[PDB]
Design a protein around this ligand. Structure first.
Ligand SMILES: CN[C@@H]1[C@@H](O)[C@@H](O[C@@H]2[C@@H](O)[C@H](O[C@H]3O[C@H]([C@@H](C)O)[C@@H](O)[C@H](O)[C@H]3N)[C@@H](N)C[C@H]2N)OC[C@]1(C)O
Lengths: 171, 61, 51, 98, 199, 192, 106
RNA sequence: ACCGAACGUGAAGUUAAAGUGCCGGAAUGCACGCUCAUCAGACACCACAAAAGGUGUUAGUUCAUCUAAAUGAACUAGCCCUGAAAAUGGAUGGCGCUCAAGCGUGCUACUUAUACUUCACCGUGAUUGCUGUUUUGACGCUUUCACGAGUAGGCAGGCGUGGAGGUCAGUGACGAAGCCUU
RNA sequence: UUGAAAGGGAAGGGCUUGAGAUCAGACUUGGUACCGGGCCAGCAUCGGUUUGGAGCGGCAGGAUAAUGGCGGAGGAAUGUGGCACGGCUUCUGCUGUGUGUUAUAGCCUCUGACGAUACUGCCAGCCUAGACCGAGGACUGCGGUUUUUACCUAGGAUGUUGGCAUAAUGAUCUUAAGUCGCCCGUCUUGAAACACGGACCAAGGA
């Protein structure tokens, strides 16, 4: 629920020399539209030599998942900043939406690399259509034949402070 | 809290009554206070404020 | 002597806004909109999905 | 604003009297009293003026007659009315249906 | 979550601090608590590490007079008591009254040997710790730092368990007999009417 | 009421027509903001302090309506880390004026409890009722200046539900200050 | 029968307080069997009696009562805030109170 | 001296910063991971640590040998370990905590300041009106609104003491004044 | 000295309530058995403020949601049935590898006409659970229902009932409990200071 995927379309303000400026689109993963347009201007100012004051947002639109109940494996390409430099990396996630995999990626780079949201650029998110496009074993092990596994040591969550029967963990 | 734009609890700084204790001056002030309150003629308001003035603010004519 | 909220007191609402009676009696708050079923995005705009 | 109740007095020991609706729990059990004559019971009937006036005894008999007539149609209803109510250990009034 | 006259807790397999915080809040709210089998309490972390921690505790003593210093109690119930007292405003009269509502024991002495013992799921080690982690038994730690009565408690606990198993065998026999009696009077009119009501 | 609905339907129609004709409809930029001071009165540098005084924002949780131009935009730019602002909807304006609407009559805060009070002070500008005043605010009319200055600064409560964990950083970075652009209405519903 | 109770058991837990300052005018009350704000809202507006014994008889009785009422829930675990005619004395932290079933809305 | 917020006397509501295992008001709340330390770690200012090492574990980058069943090399950076020695016994505030009550991140609710909102009352400053009813108080009465921190210091309105002019044809040996007193 | 009370390495203070003691009041300067009043409370309805409910309903927008379901076309493998080869099976989920495309399971992509749901917003829509407050004191105003110079929820609380007046009710004193509270004065950037004066009291004292 943290994030949505938006398209943001913008251009330069029309002038006499350039009456029909080119339209540029970006795919932005943001909590809301304010942050979405902010990210769009951030990236346009880094790539091209355009500022917010001389441009305008043309369109902001939710991009919904095509198949929100189909299990997918995603590849994500990232540029992130560590404490000591700038690095590119590629990771894989399993989810039913692109936004879900992106939220997991943000949690994952927070957990393993101490990489905050401000320190990550999402280069590309791709649905991996073939089992041969899946590279990482930590997701590849969930794509095997007749997958099954137990859940040992079930801890039941009680509504009372004191229990009159011995604890059990069967399941 | 308030970010006060002006100084708080400021008296107007204009005399609202004679400092004099003369009873007959106060009778005149009573008359012209009624007149200034009930007539909207500027002359009466001017006369009312003049009765409040101190001695150096009423030079002899 | 007492401020009464027009959003709460109906009499104060009608004292300030006479049209509130017409708005309520004409069900303006839940008025239907007549139009046709259309899908104007089915062409190029579907580039929201991929460029 | 008060409520007119009766035990019936023969069943409970509580007579025709007034109670306040905020000091009562209304249950799900219903008795058809459509044939009970309670027309003349008003505020002045319980007006203040020990021994009970004979008219009050007569009216208690009259109302309890039809009341007991309808009550026995429901099995165990009479014994339910004869028994007091109390909260046992583990009874949660917020979770209970009456 | 009912208000009880006394709550008797089997300390076996409970983690020290979690049980301590729960019991502290219980006694502070006017609930009487008894904890038995404090020798069977658990502390997370390997035995050597908790032994080092207790030795760090032992090192602290009033320099100018050792008899005024912190008093280091070695018995497992006193280890639990130290944990609990640190979670109580024990220097107030209300805190002393709360601590007067608590009783802690090695083993299960009378009259608690014939009373119901309960567990606290939020403090139970098998439910709280990740399966691979190491933990300490408080009885073993107490012996290593000077508690003298581990074998006495073990012997008395063996005797109590024999007696309790005899009790349970008798109870189980009567329960089976009563179950047979209830099944015999099944398919009765009252029983069917009860089954309609959920009972 | 008719022209509000006609304005809404026409914008919807123009967006739908742009999708059909392979175009994009860009909404008219907002002309109105509602600015709430969410910072106390201590430790404010002189220039934003003066700016906040000029916006009549001299207490925490005071709110004013500002017509957007380059001049006022740079004014609000200066006060950005001390205010929360956005674009108020019609219903938000109506709720603010109805519940916490007060008029400046002879330097006195006077409740807008009768249309006579509004008409005796803004009648010369063709404002005769509370709905005229709300209309003049919402559609930034020729006499926005007089109507908005006649309105005493709105004295809001703290939000029911609180703020985000930390207020004093921009809305974009998870704080509460700056422009939030339609979410000012949710904040005002919390605070009104 | 063996039981005659028509009230719900409760305890006087604490005053309304921050870390260092207490507010005796508001008491925090634990209702037996109530573990969520959803279940506690049944008891809002119900009357509360703290019943205690005193050395000197009044109208022949040594039993004295302090009356209050439930005002709102407190926290997430089903505690409630209560308002008594006289603030409950702090020595009763941990003492039993009686939550009445009236004013009833069942 | 930092963060929040500046203060008349109160009621109700809501918050800020900071928090919610116990001490302590508020979740042993929901969630994805990382970490096991025979000196773990635990929150700005702030009560320090470096160069340099580790085949502890985790995730990544770039090459290479592979069915003519995976594996090898260099490297990057997270937590952990080593580097890390002082004098009374002792400090993540204490207890204690290990799928945390630790570290990174997301979320839901919840707790409470002399702050904010509405109301009451006090004062200050302004403000409406008041003579054929102004009538023995117009230095009065009355309508409405805003505001209230303070050393040095200024001013205003008052309280108390000895004595003096005037007045109450005042009190008092049937007890003045003084003194003691839930 | 007597009486009362309290007391685990000071005592004292503020706030709050309990307990014990003391004080106070309306049955009035009450009116002629009744009328009428004082105090404390229950309930009802209203007004102001405010917190809730697994709330209920109407409407709008978006890819005029995306999905799903149904119909149609195309494809593939973590390949179903079938078939061919095997180690363990008297094929008693036995079993693995192959081939290939719906068969004795299914899946994916595109799409055609309908129908919903989430998300966001609007309702001068409805129902429902609690808390705190009641300033003012003939009328005058704005509105509303119009049945009418009438009535109203509309320029700030009333109705009704019980109990008590040898009393609940309030205030102070002592004490217990909870929480907070360093020794004043002074010089000073900075004082509780291991800075200075101060054992106590009266009268004098700038
Ligand atoms: C990520 N930066 C880390 C910073 O977090 C910190 O790291 C400490 C490290 O110094 C500690 O380790 C150090 O300090 C401890 C003790 C003094 O706490 C010593 O026992 C130990 O020998 C010593 N190496 C280690 N136990 C925890 C890390 N987070 O120290 C600086 C640093 C290494 O740059």
């Amino acid at each position: 629920s943290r994030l949505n995927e938006y398209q943001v379309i913008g251009r330069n303000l029309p002038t006499e020399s350039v009456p029909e400026p080119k339209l540029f689109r970006m795919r932005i993963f943001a909590p809301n539209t304010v942050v979405a347009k902010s990210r769009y201007w951030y990236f346009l100012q880094k790539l091209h030599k355009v500022k917010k004051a001389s441009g305008e947002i043309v369109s902001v639109n939710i991009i919904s998942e095509a198949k929100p109940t189909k299990v997918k494996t995603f590849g994500i390409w990232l540029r992130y900043e560590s404490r000591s430099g700038i690095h590119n990396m590629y990771k894989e996630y399993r989810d039913v939406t692109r936004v879900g995999a992106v939220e997991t990626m943000y949690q994952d780079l927070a957990a393993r690399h101490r990489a905050r949201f401000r320190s990550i650029h999402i280069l590309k998110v791709v649905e991996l259509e073939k089992t041969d496009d899946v590279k990482r074993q930590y997701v590849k092990q969930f794509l095997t034949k007749d997958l099954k596994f137990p859940l040992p040591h079930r801890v039941q969550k009680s509504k009372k402070l004191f229990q009159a029967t011995a604890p059990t963990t069967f399941y | 809290g308030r970010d006060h734009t002006s100084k708080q609890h400021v008296r107007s700084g204009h005399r609202t009554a004679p400092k004099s204790d003369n009873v007959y001056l106060q009778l005149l002030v009573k008359l012209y206070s009624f007149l200034a309150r009930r007539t909207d003629a500027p002359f009466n308001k001017v006369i009312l404020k003049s009765l409040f003035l101190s001695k150096i603010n009423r030079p002899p004519v | 002597v007492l401020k009464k909220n027009p959003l709460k007191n109906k009499q104060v609402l009608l004292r300030l806004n006479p049209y509130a009676k017409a708005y309520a009696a004409e069900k303006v708050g839940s008025a239907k909109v007549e139009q046709a079923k259309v899908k104007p995005s089915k062409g190029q705009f579907a580039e929201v999905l991929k460029n | 604003n008060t409520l007119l109740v009766s035990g019936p007095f023969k069943v409970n020991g509580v007579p025709l009297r007034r109670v306040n609706a905020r000091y009562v729990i209304a249950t799900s059990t219903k008795v058809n009293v459509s044939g009970v004559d309670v027309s003349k019971f008003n505020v002045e009937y319980f007006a203040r003026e020990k021994e009970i006036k004979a008219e009050r005894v007569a009216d208690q008999k009259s109302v309890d007659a039809a009341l007991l007539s309808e009550i026995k149609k429901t099995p165990l209803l009479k014994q339910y009315l004869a028994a007091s109510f109390s909260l046992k250990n583990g009874d949660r009034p917020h979770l209970l249906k009456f | 979550s009912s208000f009880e006259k006394v709550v008797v807790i089997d300390g076996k397999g409970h983690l020290l601090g979690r049980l301590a915080s729960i019991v502290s809040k219980q006694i502070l709210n006017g609930q009487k608590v008894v904890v038995v089998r404090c020798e069977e309490l658990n502390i997370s972390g390997e035995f050597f590490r908790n032994k080092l921690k207790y030795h760090d505790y032992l090192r602290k003593a009033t320099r100018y007079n050792k008899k005024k210093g912190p008093f280091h109690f070695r018995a497992p119930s006193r280890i639990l008591y130290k944990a609990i007292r640190g979670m109580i405003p024990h220097k107030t009269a209300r805190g002393k009254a709360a601590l007067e509502r608590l009783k802690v024991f090695e083993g299960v002495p009378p009259p608690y040997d014939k009373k119901k013992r309960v567990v606290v799921p939020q403090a139970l080690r098998v439910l709280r710790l990740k399966p691979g982690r190491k933990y300490t038994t408080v009885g073993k730690l107490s012996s290593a730092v000077g508690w003298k009565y581990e074998s006495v408690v073990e012997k008395l606990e063996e005797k109590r368990k024999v007696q309790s198993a005899e009790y349970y065998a008798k109870k189980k026999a009567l329960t089976k007999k009563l179950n047979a009696a209830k099944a015999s009077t099944a398919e009765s009119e009252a029983a069917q009417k009860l089954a309609a009501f959920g009972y | 009421q008719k022209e509000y609905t006609e304005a809404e339907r026409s914008v919807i129609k123009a967006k739908r027509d742009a999708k059909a004709s392979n175009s994009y409809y860009v909404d008219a930029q907002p002309k109105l903001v509602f600015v709430v001071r969410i910072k106390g009165i201590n430790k404010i540098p002189p220039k934003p302090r003066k700016v906040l005084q000029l916006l009549r924002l001299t207490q925490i949780n005071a709110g004013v309506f500002v017509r957007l131009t380059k001049a006022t935009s740079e004014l609000i730019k200066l006060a950005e880390p001390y205010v929360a602002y956005g674009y108020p909807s019609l219903s938000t304006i109506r709720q603010l004026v109805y519940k916490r609407g007060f008029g400046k009559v002879n330097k006195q805060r006077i409740a807008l409890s009768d249309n006579a009070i509004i008409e005796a002070n803004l009648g010369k500008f063709n404002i005769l009722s509370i709905e005229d005043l709300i209309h003049e605010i919402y559609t930034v009319g020729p006499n926005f200046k007089q109507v908005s200055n006649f309105l005493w600064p709105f004295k809001l409560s703290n939000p029911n539900g609180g703020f985000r964990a930390r207020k004093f950083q921009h809305f974009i970075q998870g704080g509460d200050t700056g422009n939030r652009e339609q979410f000012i209405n949710a904040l005002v519903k919390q605070m009104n | 029968a063996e039981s005659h109770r028509l009230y719900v058991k409760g305890k006087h837990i604490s005053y309304q307080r921050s870390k260092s300052v207490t507010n005796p005018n508001v008491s925090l009350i634990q209702i037996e069997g109530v573990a969520s704000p959803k279940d506690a809202k049944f008891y809002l507006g119900k009357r509360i009696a703290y019943v205690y014994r005193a050395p000197k008889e009044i109208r022949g009785s040594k039993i004295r009562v302090i009356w209050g009422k439930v005002t709102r829930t407190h926290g997430n675990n089903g505690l409630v805030r209560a308002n008594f005619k006289k603030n409950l004395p702090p020595k009763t932290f941990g003492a039993s109170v009686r939550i009445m079933l009236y004013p009833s809305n069942i």
